[PDB]
Amino acid sequence: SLSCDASGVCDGRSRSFTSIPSGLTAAMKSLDLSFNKITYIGHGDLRACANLQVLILKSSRINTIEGDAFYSLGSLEHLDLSDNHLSSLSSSWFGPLSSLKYLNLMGNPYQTLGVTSLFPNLTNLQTLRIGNVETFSEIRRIDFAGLTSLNELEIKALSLRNYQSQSLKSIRDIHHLTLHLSESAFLLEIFADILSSVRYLELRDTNLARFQFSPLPVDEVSSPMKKLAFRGSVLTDESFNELLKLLRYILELSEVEFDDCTLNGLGDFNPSESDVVSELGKVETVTIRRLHIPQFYLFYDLSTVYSLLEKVKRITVENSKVFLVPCSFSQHLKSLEFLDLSENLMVEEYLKNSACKGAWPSLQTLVLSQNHLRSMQKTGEILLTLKNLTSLDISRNTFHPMPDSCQWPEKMRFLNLSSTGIRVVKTCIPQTLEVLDVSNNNLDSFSLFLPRLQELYISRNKLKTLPDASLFPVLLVMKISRNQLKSVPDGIFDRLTSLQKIWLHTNPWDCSCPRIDYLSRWLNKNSQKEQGSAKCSGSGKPVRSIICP
Ligand SMILES: CCCCCCCCCCCCCCCC(=O)OC[C@H](CSC[C@H](N)CO)OC(=O)CCCCCCCCCCCCCCC
Ligand SMILES: *[C@@H]1O[C@H](CO)[C@@H](O[C@@H]2O[C@H](CO)[C@@H](O[C@H]3O[C@H](CO)[C@@H](O)[C@H](O)[C@@H]3O)[C@H](O)[C@H]2NC(C)=O)[C@H](O)[C@H]1NC(C)=O
Ligand SMILES: *[C@@H]1O[C@H](CO)[C@@H](O[C@@H]2O[C@H](CO)[C@@H](O)[C@H](O)[C@H]2NC(C)=O)[C@H](O)[C@H]1NC(C)=O
């Protein structure tokens, strides 16, 4: 009861099959039999479809597959066996799949990949996922024999009990290596085997409390590793310092991320300057999200971090409860062009210190999105200390009504006031602006003349009148959806002579014909420009559909 499209793509998904359907053809290119009750797959179940390029067998209850079940699938590029009941993999399965590009074996209860190298024959393999949560317990030297380059290899071994050294060393080039480890017992040697191949290493769920550095005795390897990411990791002030020492081998590391990690800190840890690292190679981007520091004052005078960021260009510390980025700390950030402290507890008085005189000398973009700032003027005033600043995001902050005059950094051309609760826009906003987002507020009208404005975002408001075209002589983009606009003055969009894109949907457009003429005739002559589609209130029919005599 499977249905195929004219292109040879058949759906069999969730159809209660207890066995592969009979009478398949060589016309099929993609066969999806996910979520079925297919316990056994015989020698001849898939013998016909010799031109199959995609086989989706995910989450079916497969626990038995004959060694040569896939003997005629020489054109198969995508095989998905994840989440089944395979507790033993057979090398005979992958033998005839020299055209295999994607192999997902994750989610099955096997304990190891088996006694025979399963992938030597897969010469065009680009993606491979293996392992599980409860039982995968051993990686061995024969496991990846025959694998030269993989764009991605995911290994889930949260229950790993033993890793044979050099197991991953045979692989020449791994673009993205995702490892799920519950502890750090084998992280070091693993790290010694991937220094030549891994460009992006992603560590998930690892408790690194007991990590300890030791000199990697692998021959001079110019690690091509550009990105390193930790997710849901447990760290300590001690183990953290241990990790830092690892950088000497990944001289090219440019991006580091820490997602949902907890940093446990204690006072008993206080080494001299010899133990600590203050050289951060080429690390130029630091992203930190949802970082939990149980007890922050249990950290000695944090000067240890001042020499690490001299060269950092981009930093993001979000939703990690930051209330202060100490002045001296900021002055050390000589190269910082981008700083994103979204979702923290920043307020004027502490911002003042964070953005002191020589704070962030080169900052161009500063994001203080969800914080506790309350005065627009006060914030612009405090930020005057920043001379290179060109972009500022202070959206999602609850501000008081803005004055008629304000002081903002001079080169500022981007100001985001989205979701800030304002009800009125005054001249506090500079004429120097190029991009302005006051979308999702409480505005009734926009009367600000900004001659250099190229983009205005004013969606999600209550404007009953479209802002006069002469206000933005050279506008390229206007976003005024989700408002209360019922109509537009004849010829107004033809007055936006640089307009390239415009959002008008979610507005109650009055489509009676005397009125809606120009607007409808305009949407027809400029469909390319309208993003999304404005409909008529009442019928819901697209405005452009209306024609008047
Ligand atoms: C593989 C190598 C990767 C290398 C990555 C580089 C990491 C550096 C990132 C720069 C952090 C920028 C924000 C610092 C703000 C600050 O100083 O928070 C301090 C404030 C109070 S100031 C404290 C006083 N001055 C002391 O008496 O706390 C606060 O305001 C709130 C506490 C915020 C705690 C989280 C952020 C603190 C930085 C964490 C650094 C270690 C990260 C380890 C992750 C596993
Ligand atoms: C001006 O500030 C706006 C508010 O901060 C901002 O809108 C926000 O845009 C981000 C873009 O990623 C959205 O991100 C969230 O949602 C995505 C998926 O949709 C998630 O993957 C992200 O992790 C995140 O949770 C926000 O949803 C959106 N905020 C809202 C509520 O509208 C504008 O983009 C800024 N304007 C300009 C011109 O930059
Ligand atoms: C970032 O801004 C600073 C401050 O304006 C710039 O450095 C100053 O450049 C002037 C040149 O007119 C020198 O006279 C000063 O000595 C510098 N001030 C400092 C920091 O001591 C810097 O050039 C800007 N960087 C960028 C983004 O180009």
Ligand SMILES: *[C@H]1O[C@H](CO)[C@@H](O)[C@H](O)[C@H]1NC(C)=O
């Ligand atoms: C798969 O092909 C044969 C087995 O018939 C053998 O050479 C080896 O297992 C694989 N090929 C390679 C790359 O050596």
